[PDB]
Design a protein around this ligand. Structure first.
Ligand code: YPP
Ligand code: YPP
Length: 262
């Protein structure tokens, strides 16, 4: 148990919830894990895998990102700030990817999933890039039920950090596709209260949040610290009762402990 791990355990203790953290410091490829091999519900953090899978398809189906996809009134789910503007019209897969990632649009995510042949198509992509842990089982919005002990739509912090590193800094995607994914993550609108809140102001980052029942509050990020090689950081948090409140502050605290421990 390292000093950082002990600090994360203390944070967890005062949160009353269950915290999972995985850091990969690309300066030396070292990792810091806290419940790194335990499963957590991904919620919206799964949107990165779906968007990446579509980017991979676009490497060989060249005009795929410009392909129009019909948005019908029946497609709307619980949160669709971008898709609802286009009901009875169309959005391209690039527009759907940007909406899913940067606005966490759930209808947009469902269109990515459908393009991949269902939730299993997203899992298949994960397996293709060496992630043997990730599993997507349902569409939006039920993939956010986040029931304790339920393996559906979960992953481990270790697996997600390794995957995010491969996708954003490694070669799981072609260069142009990797750059697109990084651009989308850096333009996220929903992350200032989570991991990024715990980082020094001078650092830059891209991230994808997730939220669900059981007060499930998640974030996965690629970070560029001032004067250092980039990091990949995953912070997952989930609570004992279905109606628990969101705790983005716990993710910010975890990120601050990680930054102070570098
Ligand atoms: C089947 C019943 N059921 C299970 C629970 N559930 C969700 O927990 N959905 C979650 C969901 O769709 N979460 C999405 C996600 O994790 O990307 C988006 N992130 C939420 C956020 O950042 O606050 C959102 C409300 C912008 S939607 C949700 C979490 C908190 C508040 C509202 C929705 C549902 O939507 C739902 O219908
Ligand atoms: C000769 C060995 N060999 C080399 C060629 N190959 C593949 O190209 N497999 C591909 C593979 O296993 N693709 C996966 C699969 O077939 O479930 C997933 N299906 C694709 C789709 O539905 O369009 C995906 C892009 C969502 S990934 C692969 C894709 C990306 C990264 C690595 C592998 C093989 O699998 C294979 O057997």
């Amino acid at each position: 148990t390292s000093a950082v791990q002990q600090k994360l355990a203390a944070l967890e203790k005062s949160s009353g919830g269950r915290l999972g953290v995985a850091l990969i410091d690309t300066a030396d490829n070292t990792q810091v894990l806290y419940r790194g091999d335990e499963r957590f519900p991904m919620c919206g953090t799964s949107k990165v895998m779906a968007a990446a899978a579509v980017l991979k398809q676009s490497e060989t189906q060249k005009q795929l990102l410009n392909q129009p996809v019909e948005i019908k009134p029946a497609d709307l789910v619980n949160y669709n700030p971008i898709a609802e503007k286009h009901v009875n019209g169309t959005m391209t897969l690039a527009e759907l990817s940007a909406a899913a990632l940067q606005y966490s649009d759930n209808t947009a995510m469902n269109k990515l999933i459908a393009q991949l042949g269902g939730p299993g198509g997203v899992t298949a992509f994960a397996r293709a890039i060496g992630d043997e842990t990730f599993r997507l089982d349902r569409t939006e919005p039920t993939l956010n039920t986040a029931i304790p002990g339920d393996p559906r739509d979960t992953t481990t912090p270790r697996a997600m950090a390794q995957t995010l590193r491969q996708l954003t800094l490694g070669h799981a995607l072609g260069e142009t596709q990797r750059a697109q994914l990084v651009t989308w993550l850096k333009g996220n609108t929903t992350g200032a209260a989570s991991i990024r809140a715990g980082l020094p102001t001078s650092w830059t980052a891209g991230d994808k949040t997730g939220s669900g029942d059981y007060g499930t509050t998640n974030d996965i990020a690629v970070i560029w610290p001032q004067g250092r090689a980039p990091l990949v950081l995953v912070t997952y948090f989930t609570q004992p009762q279905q109606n628990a409140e969101s705790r983005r502050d716990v993710l910010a605290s975890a990120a601050r402990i990680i930054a102070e421990g570098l």
